[PDB]
Design a protein around this ligand. Structure first.
Ligand SMILES: [Fe+3]
Ligand SMILES: [Fe+3]
Ligand SMILES: [Fe+3]
Ligand SMILES: [Fe+3]
Lengths: 287, 287
């Protein structure tokens, strides 16, 4: 595989691992309450802190994906959990990506740290629950009866993550209004993930081909569930944020927001997975 | 904590993450069979492959420590598993160390990859069992009844690892006979671990102080068990190596080697932990 081989070759060359209070820390249009009348009841100070929390939550989701889904899948790959993989080159490519992911986690932790320092406020990760994708991944894991099912669940969710993260990062990478340290952090992350998507795509194709029919089917079901979870707005995390901020009538509004917005995707660009499933000739079966 | 703070400050500056067939790939004196009469029954080719396997095994032990012990402890630290820690600076220091460890894992995987390429042989990690420290860590975990016990077990083993790894790396870092890519890989790793030892020491001191008396005691017992395991020769891994190479009479000799050498430490420099336990004024109680 020449894709794998060259990524391995030039990693040392491309890998990323080598303030204006006026600017919002985040995009208003990615806050669920921004689309509800309650937004007008809020003070400029509260609006500002909700933007800060938004950024913090976006960082937390990214860290949680890397630590609970992506890296655990990479480790299972290296440990031989899946048929159709193996060989020294893949091991090196994956070992490199694990470094990248850990560095991405650091970048996002620092993104939040800078916000906390500059705004002079805690915005603690401890306030936030498990992100929506983390939750759904864990629910699927808990329904597994066999080890092979858990490992395929994680692969499916990680494939979705690695192939769709570019579109999640795109949401802030291009935004010229928000804090530039925030956009630049997201852009830099975005660079690495282009190459990760290629690796993850290749690996998925090969595992799928080498799996028996029952296990193939189980894997695609996990890919489906993962994408659904990945692209959704995290209503639950935002509910934790607005409760902690003491927004009056947050609960009633939250119910109304789930009703009105339960159907919109935060991430609308699904071209990564669409294209992967097309190249695999399995797009036939989907939700 | 100024130690923590400056390590955080200058990480971007110090972090490492930014062939002669004639030369042995490893040190003969770290092969258990080197000290037994069977060594004279072996061909130069077999002696050479055992040196290669030695290096490969040493890389595998290092990877297994990073992936099963060190990074899992760092993640528990960040997730608030232990009293007496917390705060943004520690989180950044630890997030940085996790990048380092993952990079060390890559360096050691590449160390083995180069050996496999240049010697034109598989020396597969799949032949090697769990390393001795990995085994003992896992045995202690399996005896735990409560979550808090598992997290303290991992902390204790990780503290030992982070504070003692310099002495394990020293064994090859200075060796001017072995392959220079091998020595240089180990030296480069060694650079980072000086700073890791400081972090890990600080964290241990503070957790211990904040723990109740029963939990303090449990933690030190785990430190003790960890050091014992960490410094021992891995007789079991070497047994897998010599069996796979088809050394005649390996089994009888292996028994004799455990008898004669069961008492020697591969790692004789225990100054890291000795000094930590002295500064904590708990050296009183030991094995
Ligand atoms: Fe990433
Ligand atoms: Fe990635
Ligand atoms: Fe290390
Ligand atoms: Fe370390």
């Amino acid at each position: 595989n020449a894709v794998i081989n060259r990524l391995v070759g030039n990693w040392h060359r491309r890998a990323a691992v080598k303030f204006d209070p006026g600017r919002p820390d985040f995009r208003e249009d990615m806050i669920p309450f921004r689309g509800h009348p309650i937004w007008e009841r809020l003070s400029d100070e509260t609006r500002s802190r909700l933007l800060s929390w938004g950024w913090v939550a976006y960082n937390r989701n990214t860290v949680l994906i890397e630590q609970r889904i992506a890296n655990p899948a990479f480790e299972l790959v290296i440990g031989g959990a899946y048929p159709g993989l193996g060989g020294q080159q893949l091991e090196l490519a994956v070992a490199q990506a694990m470094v990248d992911e850990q560095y991405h986690t650091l970048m996002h932790i620092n993104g939040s740290a800078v916000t906390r320092r500059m705004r002079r406020s805690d915005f603690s990760d401890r306030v936030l629950p498990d992100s929506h994708i983390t939750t759904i991944h864990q629910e699927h894991l808990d329904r597994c009866e066999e080890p092979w099912q858990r490992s395929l669940t994680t692969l499916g969710f990680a494939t979705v993550a690695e192939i769709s993260i570019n579109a999640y990062l795109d949401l802030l990478a291009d935004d010229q209004e928000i804090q530039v340290v925030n956009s630049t952090t997201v852009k830099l992350h975005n660079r690495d993930e282009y190459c990760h998507a290629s690796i993850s795509g290749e690996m998925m194709k090969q595992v799928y081909e080498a799996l028996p029919a029952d296990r193939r089917r189980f894997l695609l079901e996990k890919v489906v569930a993962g994408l659904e979870a990945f692209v959704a707005p995290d209503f639950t995390t935002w509910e934790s944020i607005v409760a902690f901020e003491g927004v009056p009538g947050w609960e009633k509004a939250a119910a109304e927001v789930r009703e009105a917005q339960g159907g919109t995707h935060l991430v609308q660009d699904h071209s990564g997975i669409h294209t992967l499933l097309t190249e695999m000739d399995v797009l036939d079966q989907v939700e």
